């Protein structure tokens, strides 16, 4: 994020840019005025988790981030299996040449 | 939550990311101005 460099794949249910930006917006911020006649008018503000919540909403399986110095590697991996088995038996009794 | 790492499964009726974020938003927060000429203008706020 210091530059705009990404190796991005949108096929996976998680994009690295959205994850990184949402992580950034969730940090605590200090707007220190230093309007020095109140010499040190700082402030603190808790971050917002909306972008991070939206980024992780569709993730199925493993999505693990590893930081190694101004470079983040996101690994995604999942395996899905499903089975279905249905039996139905309707029956009716009629007379010859009649509709049922 | 320090990173974005999750091993998430939505089939279950509970997703870990939503649980963790909701737990975080329910904590007590201190917006300490330290606008030092009231040297220590703190505040406290109950979580949602």
């Amino acid at each position: 994020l210091e530059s705009g460099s990404v190796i991005q794949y949108g096929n996976t249910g998680a994009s690295i840019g959205n994850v990184m930006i949402g992580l950034e917006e969730a940090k605590d911020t200090t707007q220190t005025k230093a309007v020095y006649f109140l010499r040190n008018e700082t402030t603190t503000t808790k971050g917002d988790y909306t972008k991070l919540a939206s980024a992780l909403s569709s993730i199925q399986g493993a999505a693990v981030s590893i930081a190694m110095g101004d470079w983040t590697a996101l690994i995604n991996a999942v395996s899905n299996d499903s089975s279905s088995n249905i039996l139905s038996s309707p029956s009716i009794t009629v007379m010859d040449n009649g509709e049922a």
Side-chain angles (χ1 to χ4, degrees), chain A:
Chain A
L1 213 62
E2 46 167 52
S3 44
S5 318
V6 286
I7 297 172
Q8 205 170 240
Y9 301 117
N11 283 43
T12 73
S15 36
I16 186 143
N18 276 353
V19 168
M20 294 197 283
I21 293 167
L23 230 46
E24 214 65 348
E25 305 205 348
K27 269 161 151 2
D28 291 334
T29 39
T30 139
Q31 321 298 348
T32 153
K33 306 264 300 303
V35 275
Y36 86 80
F37 218 107
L38 315 92
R39 319 273 280 310
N40 218 64
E41 285 191 21
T42 51
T43 322
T44 233
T45 285
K46 327 293 282 104
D48 51 70
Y49 275 106
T50 325
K51 187 158 289 327
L52 198 54
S54 314
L56 307 182
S57 64
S58 37
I59 291 197
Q60 209 165 299
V64 161
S65 324
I66 308 298
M68 46 214 318
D70 69 89
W71 270 113
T72 310
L74 192 39
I75 305 181
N76 74 275
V78 74
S79 173
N80 288 329
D81 189 275
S82 154
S83 191
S84 169
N85 194 348
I86 309 187
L87 272 182
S88 171
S89 281
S91 91
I92 198 135
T93 312
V94 225
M95 283 210 283
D96 199 1
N97 305 302
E99 37 161 20

